[PDB]
């Protein structure tokens, strides 16, 4: 019952009133899907979308936090953000040289792409992929992580969504990231590959053709169980393909490593290695 008044304050020409309202709204939206629905129902979306045109970085940042938090809701709540017309203005911020704005725009986009296939396709259709793929070359590890989240989310969809990621040229950069000494960035690259390889055989074969298998097989020898798990999930997904895909996995030397991992003390590792080994007969 205070929400409608907060939403009206988003138009106040008093920047203190505006910012107080915006900070309250963003944080109510962080409190679960019912609180998100209350913010939507109070009419916040059109005002928040208008704020994506603001040249005031303080307003824009908090507007982005609010939209990100709404987009942490259910798929139809995400769709409300898309229907309010946010995506072009949001995607355009991936050109920003302001790292705070870029980071916050990426979170918002990544959350939208965590929706269902209609929500993901909207992000693709808004033109985000070339930018996201270029940010895989960023020397800023925060930005790089966030781009990998967004891309992983996009690649969590169906085969058409996956294929748009592949067609944007993500695979060579993802495979290059497999040699990173940054264990955080490595695992995010493996997540992206392990979503792409959960597609159909054409998507799996793209992962193979980009040269992922030698690096994944090397990573089966990692002493870091977090890395090993992620590499095993990726390789197991590839092994779920057709006989051409299975053969490529065998040719890369995976069988001998997987046989070794069958008795691993970590149960999650052992189970996925067993499952992978069975897929390959």
């Amino acid at each position: 019952s205070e929400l409608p008044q907060m939403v009206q304050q988003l138009n106040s020409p008093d920047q203190q009133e505006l910012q107080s309202a915006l900070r309250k709204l963003s944080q109510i939206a962080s409190g679960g899907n019912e609180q998100i629905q209350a913010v939507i129902d109070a009419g916040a979306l059109p005002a928040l979308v208008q704020l994506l045109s603001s040249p005031n970085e303080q307003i824009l940042q908090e507007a982005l936090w609010a939209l990100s938090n709404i987009a942490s809701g259910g798929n139809e709540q995400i769709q409300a953000v898309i229907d309010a017309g946010a995506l072009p203005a949001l995607v355009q911020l991936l050109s920003s040289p302001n790292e705070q704005i870029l980071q916050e725009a990426l979170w918002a986009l990544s959350n939208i792409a965590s929706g269902g296939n209609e929500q993901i396709q909207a992000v693709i259709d808004a033109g985000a992929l070339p930018a996201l793929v270029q940010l895989l070359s960023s020397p800023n590890e925060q930005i790089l992580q966030e781009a990998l989240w967004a891309l992983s989310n996009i690649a969590s969809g169906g085969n058409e969504q996956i294929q748009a990621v592949i067609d944007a040229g993500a695979l060579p950069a993802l495979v290059q990231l497999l040699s990173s000494p940054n264990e955080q960035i490595l695992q995010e690259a493996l997540w992206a590959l392990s979503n792409i390889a959960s597609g159909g055989n054409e998507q799996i074969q793209a992962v193979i053709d980009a040269g992922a298998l030698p690096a994944l097989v090397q990573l089966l020898s990692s002493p870091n169980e977090q890395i090993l798990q992620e590499a095993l999930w990726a390789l197991s997904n590839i092994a779920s393909g057709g006989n051409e895909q299975k053969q490529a996995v065998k040719e890369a030397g995976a069988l001998e490593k997987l046989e070794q991992l069958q008795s691993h003390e970590n149960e999650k590792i052992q189970k996925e290695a067993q499952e992978a080994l069975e897929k390959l007969q």
Binding site: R23, S26, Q27, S30, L64, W65, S68, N69, A71, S72, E104, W107, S110, N111, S114, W149, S152, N153, S156, W191, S194, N195, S198
Partner: peptide, 10 residues
């Protein structure tokens, strides 16, 4: 098929 969300909280 693995999705993730990030909230922005103070």
């Amino acid at each position: 098929k693995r999705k993730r969300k990030r909230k922005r909280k103070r």
